[PDB]
Amino acid sequence: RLYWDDLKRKLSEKLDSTDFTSTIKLLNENSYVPREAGSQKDENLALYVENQFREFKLSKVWRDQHFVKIQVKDSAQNSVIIVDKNGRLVYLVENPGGYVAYSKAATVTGKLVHANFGTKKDFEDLYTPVNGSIVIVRAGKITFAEKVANAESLNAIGVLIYMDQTKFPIVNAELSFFGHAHLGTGDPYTPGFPSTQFPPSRSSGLPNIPVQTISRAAAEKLFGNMEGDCPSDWKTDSTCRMVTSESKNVKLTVSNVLKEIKILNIFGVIKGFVEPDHYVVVGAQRDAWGPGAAKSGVGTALLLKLAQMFSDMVLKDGFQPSRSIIFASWSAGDFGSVGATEWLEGYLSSLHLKAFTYINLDKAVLGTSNFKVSASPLLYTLIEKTMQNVKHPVTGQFLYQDSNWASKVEKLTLDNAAFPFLAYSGIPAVSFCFCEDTDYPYLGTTMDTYKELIERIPELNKVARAAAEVAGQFVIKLTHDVELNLDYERYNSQLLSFVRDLNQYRADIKEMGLSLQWLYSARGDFFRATSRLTTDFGNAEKTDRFVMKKLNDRVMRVEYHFLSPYVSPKESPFRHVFWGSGSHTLPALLENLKLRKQNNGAFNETLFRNQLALATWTIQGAANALSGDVWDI
Amino acid sequence: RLYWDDLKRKLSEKLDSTDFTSTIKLLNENSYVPREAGSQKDENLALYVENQFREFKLSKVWRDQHFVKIQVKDSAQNSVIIVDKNGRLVYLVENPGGYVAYSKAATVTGKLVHANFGTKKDFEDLYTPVNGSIVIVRAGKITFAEKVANAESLNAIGVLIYMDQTKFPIVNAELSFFGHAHLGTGDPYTPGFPSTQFPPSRSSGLPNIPVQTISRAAAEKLFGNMEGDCPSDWKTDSTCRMVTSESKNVKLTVSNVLKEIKILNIFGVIKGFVEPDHYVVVGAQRDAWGPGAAKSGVGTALLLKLAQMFSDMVLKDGFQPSRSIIFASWSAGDFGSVGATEWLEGYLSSLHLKAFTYINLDKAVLGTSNFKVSASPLLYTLIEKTMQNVKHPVTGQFLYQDSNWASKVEKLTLDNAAFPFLAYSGIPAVSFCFCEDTDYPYLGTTMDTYKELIERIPELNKVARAAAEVAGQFVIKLTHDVELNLDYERYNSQLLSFVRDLNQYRADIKEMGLSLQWLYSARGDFFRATSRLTTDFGNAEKTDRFVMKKLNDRVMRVEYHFLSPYVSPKESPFRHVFWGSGSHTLPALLENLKLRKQNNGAFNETLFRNQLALATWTIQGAANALSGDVWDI
Lengths: 633, 633
Hints:
This is part of a larger assembly, with two copies of chain A.
Chain A: H1 4-16, H2 20-26, H3 40-56, E1 60-72, E2 79-84, E3 89-94, E4 100-101, E5 106-110, E6 112-114, H4 120-124, E7 134-138, H5 144-152, E8 158-162, E9 179-180, E10 211-213, H6 216-223, E11 226-229, E12 241-244, E13 248-254, E14 257-270, E15 275-285, H7 293-315, E16 323-330, H8 338-346, E17 355-360, E18 370-375, H9 380-387, H10 418-425, E19 429-435, H11 450-456, H12 460-480, H13 490-502, H14 517-539, H15 545-558, H16 586-594, H17 605-626
Parallel strand pairs in A: 4-9, 6-7, 7-8, 8-10, 15-16, 15-17, 17-19
Antiparallel strand pairs in A: 1-14, 2-3, 2-13, 5-13, 11-12, 14-16, 18-19
Helix pairs in contact in A: 1-12, 2-7, 3-7, 7-12, 8-10, 9-12, 13-14, 14-17, 16-17
PDB class: metal binding protein
Keywords: Ferritin, Complex
Entry title: Single Particle Cryo-EM map of human Transferrin receptor 1 - H-Ferritin complex at 5.5 Angstrom resolution.
């Protein structure tokens, strides 16, 4: 067993002589260049990664194979067409190079209406009714899946998406791009039974309208046939317009088809010396529509180098992780973390007893200016201590520069592979990156190349190196300390913050005959439960692996006990009342209640009483799950 | 620490000098005599039990209080009336002394039709259509809740239930009786929010028709006005008839009302010396409609004596249970294990990590001829070894007399408090009793008295003594051995048996384009997972509480991982794919498939493909949950 100081030094010095850019460049070679999930090139890289793991001599390397239905574009072209309502003659504007996976295959003709980013707010602020019209929106702010849903929610009949030059200062205006519009993760077409025969989807999260990505040039050509200046508030090109002329409307034809593919998740593992049946999981997306250097290459490179380093530290330098470290190369990430989700779904309710943390490595390097982090609050302390002794690659200062960084942390979103881990599986998760206030413009394009990457970021090797150090320090701390570096006390602030918000309606809870007393008591009981647990840790003999096991297991279950037990994972997979999606999340409870100031019928008093109940029960249950022995109350 | 041989002797000799009949008699005194749930007498007994626990000096004794809505009969009498369709004049036949909790409060008039036991089969074998008619059925075979559901399922408008003299050779034909018809357990009116305001119930399992219990005399008076002899196949009184005369039909008026009551679950605990945060739970129903000597008294008596004995063994004789023993006195058992279920529901998904076994003590003594057992397969080995060294109270031979007893074991039913533990909470459970091939006739009547009990069973003290020895040996084995006496290998036979059944349709699975290959692989993987676990146990150092903790925790999770993760506990609480209720259970999958030999539209091919899928996923998940470390595959 080594000292944390030595492990820190060892990791750092191994990192010093590590060549990241070579690997990123290597992954950008023609053997791997265009690696859409399931393709032979994806399969090539999968084989290469797998071989590398074998050369690193990890305890065991294996395959997690899955068959899934994705959507690819048909031999028939998707098309964007302008129609003259006079005589109904059509003019072809574009056959897009790209497409949007999970779009309804359909042909729709209507008026075209701009809706900015297609955010929920953008739609309400519209002075043009979207109903029965095709909508065009800029990429960014929110996922394609959300834009489609918001629009579909207002009865739009189709969606176009372009990259405006203000948000995406790309010289080539003919660039086409890719994404998906499945409002979830995993395979949307997952019949619980094999079939020839065709069953409907139900609560799939799939679009019922066609959605399609277009080049900025094609959008500006559409603007050429539209009227109305865009609000300066949108801060967009002067090109932009709002609505088709009276005599014209647009026709969209999407003919994407379902294809079944064989994806491979490639796994390596360094077994733990004390509790090998518990693991930290480190993963990266291996697939990409185009070259996907930043989208896929960076992550896969870090995955490979981290795996190599840790294998060397165990075999040469005497590092002895208490718990196991699993390295995961995912496929079909581009379709909604499909690879990751399929694997997660094998262990719906059991995984949280083995995996205590997931570290995502996707898009860790996109810029230089900033260091962003999204994570479970359970990892805020680990993250903080890690930023306090990792240096900025350009700047030289420690990453930790703001004592208040934790309150400004944004939550994991659906397009992040870290999301299903936290919100569906109840495993604390963290994603982080070096970046700007600007999205990396080339993501999802054929311009996401190494050359492009090394050009916007000439210090690529140093920056990737800093990204590896944070992930590496995470992984060491997590498998070295006898306690788990999961700060369960953090959820007191979260509950406090939530009740603090809720208490801004102590009046409206009166006019409904409701007391919030049982909820306050749940919050109090959780506080007590954490306090007792901290005391127990302090009074425990750190060398007694039996008592630590027992205390650590309690910590490992905190996250999962915030998954609502009162909703089916099939109907709503994202059960986490803090971080998931649906009417069972604390945020939903607040939004339903904010709709009570308006005397409009949007408020749903009944729903709220149920939400209040389920929240209280969930929180009580978590407090009770943490308290320990049934005679201690 | 003592030797199993000494603990066996100690338990036995303490039992030898234990006076059971005194306690049963004591519970039959006027201070407790009629103790309907929530009543003052129930509350008296609750206080007495609680005091006794305090005198026994258990580690901690506490209260688990709940407010629940039960139904009691109104000041207005329920009535059974015969109507002359000529002139519509009515004749009062009875104002029943008893009632059926959860009956719809309503008045209905129609023809009366006998349907034997009201089993699903009994209805199909009817040559008289039940639709729009009131139905009369004999008690027995199935719960009232099922009879009502089956009848309601065929559009009957009301249900009468009597005790025929063949199944219930009771001299007094005027005897009235009680039960409930809620097709589940727990409080059916559980709004997730407090209210004045009234919300509908939804998937409550509540009757939409009136149901009422009548005396045999009242039934025979009804038969007096009916025609058609009953099938000799029913083996019932010659009195019985099938249908009202042309000119007559029956009117039923039920006016039961909802009352909110305060129930108390009384708990005692003897803390474990090694893992106190894990418990065996031993419970008994304290409430009864009448005197409920057999229904409630026996169980509560055993609960008290067991608690006392084990407290003495810990404090005087040096017994040191590894894990905790909790003694539970439940209330509102008579309404569907309501007390038990309410408590279970506080720990929906967390309880199975603390409670590894529930032993039910209800109706353990009803006769002398037989010893019956129902339980999770996880306890078959414990049960067997226990029968191999417990003697029959009358006979003197060991209870174990049939090497094949396990394949003839009937599953826990809904009226058993052991049921929600296993099927809703995923905690292995066992109920057992000494009994006959005949139901104890006085259950749910005012004749369930000590005097009646001591009369049909003069060896009451000896028989109760044998009942305590099995429960006691269960409890000792379970808290003494370093391994858990949960035989997880047993579920290989279960899966085998199930697939063996399913394989009787390998043809019909072809005509649907389906392979069963992924299901076979799940079964294989579970087999592997258990084999590996047995090996691990063998290779473990029995004195290393850390490794044992880890292996025992894996065993403790087997049961729960058979709860279907794909159904909400609110919509269907009984999620256990082997032992629960609904379309997600393996049995349901078989029944849907047996409906494919008939070319009638009852078969539901789509449903089956989903069932096949969910089953496969559930089983795979359980196998994967058992395999241990993610690098072991």
